[PDB]
Amino acid sequence: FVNQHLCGSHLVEALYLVCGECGFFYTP
Amino acid sequence: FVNQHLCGSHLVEALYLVCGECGFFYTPK
Amino acid sequence: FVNQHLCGSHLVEALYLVCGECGFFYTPK
Amino acid sequence: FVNQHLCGSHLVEALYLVCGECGFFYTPK
Amino acid sequence: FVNQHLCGSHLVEALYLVCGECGFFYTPK
Amino acid sequence: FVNQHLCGSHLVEALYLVCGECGFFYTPK
Amino acid sequence: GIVEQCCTSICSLYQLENYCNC
Amino acid sequence: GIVEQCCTSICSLYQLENYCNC
Amino acid sequence: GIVEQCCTSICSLYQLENYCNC
Amino acid sequence: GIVEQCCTSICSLYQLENYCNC
Amino acid sequence: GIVEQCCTSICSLYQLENYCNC
Amino acid sequence: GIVEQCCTSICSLYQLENYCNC
Ligand SMILES: [Cl-]
Ligand SMILES: [Cl-]
Ligand SMILES: [Zn+2]
Ligand SMILES: [Zn+2]
């Protein structure tokens, strides 16, 4: 689903800013 | 120099695309 | 038609990454 | 050449908005 | 409300480009 | 300066996220 | 507000310019 | 997952922090 | 075109290469 | 300003929140 | 090209429009 | 890490794949 695909792109950017030096895991 | 904070933002967008359904861990340091 | 506009924004970034030095063409619907 | 790569990502997003219905070719060379 | 939240991100990206050194006022009310 | 320009694009997307319903004035000068 | 005006239909350049602080 | 949680409604700072790798 | 092909179902990297200008 | 503070070093979300219009 | 023109000094909207395919 | 490798030189798509969780 493309709508999910577009949402996920914004999610990973938010995780990048929120998590800082910790980094994050993105698991769809 | 390369602003590593800005570059990282693009890296995680690129991993999102390349890795597809695999996903990824992002470990800056 | 907001949907297609938002989709296109992401498509262009993806083509930028995938196509490398070949570049790409973007023609909206 | 990393900074040029990062810049080009932003350029194609700007072209997408600026060019509207016309679309555009992105030609890194 | 996610559709408006994702669209708003592209909005401020557009305002940033459109407004340049004038800056801009983002008020979602 | 393009480096400042690219940085500001990321700053406003970050402010969009952080500021939520308050929104923000982006005042580069 | 700007979300109501610009996320149901794509806003023109002129509409976006309303929000600049020139 | 994060998609069903955060693409159907807006996730707050606290909700997003759940996915950090501290 | 790419919008018809890629804005409802996700286009893979391989499919997106169809729209490169090589 | 925000460019001087946040483009030469990383500003956290908390530093960025000072620039909101609450 | 657009990279040489627009990646050290900021390109205006009018400068970017030259690269469109109208 | 990926920052040391891919923010000093451009990483290809294949090289970015190195960092996926496949
Ligand atoms: Cl979107
Ligand atoms: Cl950048
Ligand atoms: Zn989007
Ligand atoms: Zn950038």
The full set of domain ranges for chain F reads 1-29
Method: X-ray
How far is C-alpha L11 from the geometric centre of its chain's CA atoms? Answer: 5
Report the first-to-last Cα separation within chain C, whole angstroms.
10
**Is any Cβ of chain A less than 8 angstroms from the Cβ of F22?**
no
- Look up residue C5 and give its two tokens: 């506009």
Contacts of E2 in chain H (CB under 8 A): 6-10
- Look up residue I18 and give its two tokens: 């169809």
3-state secondary structure of D24: strand
- What resolution in angstroms does the PDB record give? 1.6
**Is any Cβ of chain I less than 8 angstroms from the Cβ of A26?**
no
CA distances for E21 relative to A19, E15, F4, F6, G21, angstroms? 30, 11, 11, 13, 9
User: CA L7, L10, L12, L14: dihedral to nearest 10 degrees?
Assistant: -30
- In whole angstroms, how large is the CA radius of gyration of chain K? 8
User: CA A26, E15, F5, C25: dihedral to nearest 10 degrees?
Assistant: 70
Contacts of J13 in chain A (CB under 8 A): 17-18
Cβ–Cβ below 8 Å for G1 and E8: no
Residue ranges of E strands in A1-28: 24-26
Out of L1, L7, L19, the one facing B15 most closely (by C-beta) is: L19
CA distance B27 to L3: 9
CA distance C3 to C29: 12
